[PDB]
A paper describes a structure:
Ferredoxins are small iron–sulfur proteins and key players in essential metabolic pathways. For catalysis, CYPs required electrons typically supplied by redox proteins, such as ferredoxins. Interestingly, two Mtb 3Fe–4S ferredoxins, Fdx and FdxE, are co-located in respective operons with cytochrome P450 (CYP) enzymes suggesting their functional relevance. Here, we explored the genome context for two ferredoxins, Fdx and FdxE, determined the binding kinetics between FdxE and CYP143, and solved three crystal structures: Fdx, CYP143, and a complex FdxE–CYP143.
To visualize structural changes in CYP143 induced by the interaction with FdxE we solved the CYP143 structure alone at similar resolution (1.4 Å). CYP143 structure is conforming to the typical cytochrome P450 fold with 12 α-helices (A–L) and 4 β-sheets. In the absence of the ligand, protein crystallized in open conformation with the heme cofactor accessible to the bulk solvent. The iron of the heme is hexacoordinated by the invariant Cys342 and a water molecule. This water is stabilized by the H-bond with glycerol molecule from a cryoprotectant solution. Superposition of the CYP143 structure with the CYP143 part of the complex structure shows RMSD = .932Å for all atoms and reveals a different position of the lower part of the meander. In the CYP143 structure alone, the meander is away from the K helix, while in the complex it moves closer and sandwiched between helix 2 of FdxE and K helix of CYP. The relocation distance of 5.5 Å is observed for the Gly327 Ca atom. A closer examination of the interacting regions of CYP143 reveals a different side chain conformation of the charged residues involved in intermolecular contacts with Fdx in a complex structure Gln99 of the C helix, and Arg266 of the K helix. The local proximal area involved in the interaction with FdxE is positively charged, despite overall theoretical pI = 6.8.
Residue numbers in the entry: 9 to 393
Write the structure that this text describes.
């Protein structure tokens, strides 16, 4: 029998502020396909992973190519074959082995940021560390002036806040303009005087990227690759603050910190859904969606679906295997997944090395702002002696 009765929920009502497990369970139990505020949400593992793996049918470009004549969103908003070329070009720069060479530098800068905090006996971990750490390391990785961090964070925040909004303010437009001008100058310089950095090297070789391609990639990294890590830092420190024995076991334990970070990305993925638009009719859960349907693939829900011991609502350090789709799946799987793991494991290890014992401030209940453009904690007040 076919499915003619589409479930509908109001997104803003999902019980998501306090516990993402309750929120995703509410959505998952509404059905395999759930219509919320213009989009068809695919909630079940079999459909989500098949859809992520089928770019011909579930297009990223149709969901993510901006209107007007913007910079190309390389590679997020491309489908094969163009996407395949982009990922082939970028893969070597983002591999675990390539990024491992940056580790002494990233570690040095992480230690410095922790140094400035540890003597206070308190911090608000989002404003004081999580919101700053990703851009600091980005400047280090890509060879940008360290003194530009304040301006760049301001620009990033303004651009993220204004995206997909009908009436941008004059301050928003100016911030977008200043960021674009700043990045344009940087890429042009790297094309004329290439160094042994990524943004220089991608513009040289047998198949190089154009200036406009590197400009679009640079914008995408800033808008997509930084706040995601910020969010994950907050959840990492929250769980450590309220689990003393886990904290103690993880200190000076890179093997177990790796596992912990996988659990944080599994359970609180910073981008819990991926948008696509269908290119032809498809049947999911017995229900046929016409061509051109806007869908959202629910990776965070799938990560919690209970189908095995690695997909529960609990933080699970045990078990031989840890696996998940918090970095997505299929060909668009997070280009920066290896960098995110490096940065998060580095932050946890170095935090524990200088601040092994800490706790949540009194009467603090962790929540996200929901609905909003962020799945990050609103704030995270920490205390230590
Ligand atoms: C915990 C941190 C992160 C999470 C949870 C995350 C999550 C994701 C997800 C789910 C996707 C797939 C989106 C889709 O299929 O439409 C994605 C793509 C991407 N991410 Fe991340 N990300 C993180 C960190 C980073 C970092 C650190 C970088 C680089 C600095 C980065 C750069 C990218 C890029 C360029 C893509 C597009 C890849 C493509 O379309 O082929 N991300 N990310
Ligand atoms: Cl406080």
């Amino acid at each position: 029998a076919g499915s003619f009765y589409l479930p509908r929920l109001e997104y803003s009502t999902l019980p998501m502020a306090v516990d993402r497990g309750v929120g995703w369970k509410t959505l998952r139990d509404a059905g395999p396909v759930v219509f919320m505020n213009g989009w068809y949400y695919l909630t079940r593992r079999e459909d989500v992973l098949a859809a992520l793996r089928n770019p011909k049918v579930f297009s990223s470009r149709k969901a993510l190519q901006p209107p007007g004549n913007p910079l190309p969103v390389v590679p997020l908003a491309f489908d094969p074959p163009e996407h395949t070329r982009y990922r082939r070009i970028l893969q070597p720069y983002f591999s675990p082995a390539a990024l491992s060479k940056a580790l002494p530098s990233l570690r040095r800068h992480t230690v410095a940021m922790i140094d400035a905090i540890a003597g206070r006996g308190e911090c608000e971990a989002m404003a004081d560390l999580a919101n700053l750490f990703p851009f600091q390391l980005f400047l280090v990785l890509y060879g940008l002036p360290l003194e530009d961090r304040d301006r760049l964070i301001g620009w990033k925040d303004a651009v993220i806040a204004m995206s997909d909004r009908p009436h941008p303010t004059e301050a928003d437009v100016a911030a977008a303009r200043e960021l674009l001008e700043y990045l344009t100058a940087m890429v042009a310089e790297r094309r004329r005087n290439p160094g042994p950095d990524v943004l220089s090297q991608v513009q040289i070789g047998e198949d190089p990227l154009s200036e406009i391609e590197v400009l679009g990639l640079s914008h995408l990294l800033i808008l997509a690759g930084l706040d995601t890590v910020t969010a994950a830092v907050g959840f990492s420190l929250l769980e450590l603050a309220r689990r003393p024995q886990l904290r103690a076991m993880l200190r000076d334990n890179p093997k177990q910190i790796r596992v912990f970070i996988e659990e944080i990305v599994r359970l609180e993925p910073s981008a819990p859904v991926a948008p696509r638009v269908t290119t032809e009719p498809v049947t999911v859960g017995g229900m046929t969606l016409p061509a051109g349907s806007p869908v959202r693939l629910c990776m965070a829900a799938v990560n919690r679906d209970g189908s095995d011991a690695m997909s529960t609502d609990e933080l699970v350090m045990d078990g031989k295997v840890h696996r998940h789709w918090g970095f997505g799946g299929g060909p668009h799987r997070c280009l920066g997944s290896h960098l995110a793991r490096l940065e998060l494991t580095l932050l946890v290890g170095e935090w524990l090395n200088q601040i092994p014992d800490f706790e949540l401030a009194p009467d603090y209940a962790p929540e996200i702002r929901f609905p909003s453009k962020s799945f990050a904690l609103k704030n995270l007040p920490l205390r230590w002696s």
